[PDB]
Design a protein around this ligand. Structure first.
Ligand SMILES: [Zn+2]
Length: 258
């Protein structure tokens, strides 16, 4: 049974094919802001996206991925909790069927309308495929989305979605600047975790920003027009593609701010 987000193949089923689903460092988690400790030894976070080169956008049947050329040292994350340099490979979102749900992480149980994941691999492991064999192979910057004013820098993504409606469709998607998706502040929480989709590998230093970005109702409505199914199969709207919060299991969440 191909994994997904439905009643018979959704998150409660994943552990059968991917037993790490019940591991010690699974994501997402609820961020209890009152038990996250400020860590003054955290270096400032460095998000350097000015030379980023997007290549393509792809509906993979679970979300849409905007992919980058990661063959050179061009869009990198470093500092904060990280001990090396991590290179951007792709970003994607999780979102709900309703504005009241859709994020993976929660903040004192609060769910946002959506959540953006910018996925980076540790350059000391040479590429993404080898990085995912390592416990510190990945760093994911998570950014919450709330519904309000439109985010202009998101609109180029919104407008290509009609060309990738169904699973397996891809489109050229060059010159997209992910700096237009970032909120003002880089204040964050950080904790060790996992990929939130199968194979759920425990490679990730999570860096979750406190400040959400606002997107318009119309922008998120266009996300909900995508399809999980392939062309020529019955239409199932791509909505509620979020894994719920998982047990923290005595991990600690650190805050970059007071
Ligand atoms: Zn994700």
């Amino acid at each position: 049974h191909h994994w997904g987000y439905g009643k018979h193949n959704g998150p409660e089923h994943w552990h059968k094919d991917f037993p790490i689903a019940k591991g010690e460092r699974q994501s997402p988690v609820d961020i209890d802001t009152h038990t996250a400790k400020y860590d003054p030894s955290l270096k400032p976070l460095s998000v350097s996206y000015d030379q980023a080169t997007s290549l393509r956008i792809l509906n993979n049947g679970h979300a849409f991925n905007v992919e980058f050329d990661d063959s050179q040292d061009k869009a990198v994350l470093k500092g904060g909790p990280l001990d090396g340099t991590y290179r951007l490979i792709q970003f994607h979102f999780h979102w709900g069927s309703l504005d009241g749900q859709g994020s993976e992480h929660t903040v004192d149980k609060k769910k946002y309308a959506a959540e953006l994941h910018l996925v980076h691999w540790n350059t000391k492991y040479g590429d993404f495929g080898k990085a995912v064999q390592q416990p510190d192979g990945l760093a994911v910057l998570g950014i919450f989305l709330k519904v309000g004013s439109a985010k202009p820098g998101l609109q180029k993504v919104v407008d290509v979605l009609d060309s990738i409606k169904t699973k397996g469709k891809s489109a050229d998607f060059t010159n997209f600047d992910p700096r237009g998706l970032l909120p003002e502040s880089l204040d964050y929480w950080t904790y060790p975790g996992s990929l939130t989709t199968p194979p759920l590998l425990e490679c990730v230093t999570w860096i979750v920003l406190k400040e959400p970005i606002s997107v318009s109702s119309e922008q998120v409505l266009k996300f909900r027009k995508l399809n999980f199914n392939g062309e020529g199969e019955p239409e199932e709207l791509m909505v509620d593609n979020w894994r719920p919060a998982q047990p923290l299991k005595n991990r600690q969440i650190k805050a970059s701010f007071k």
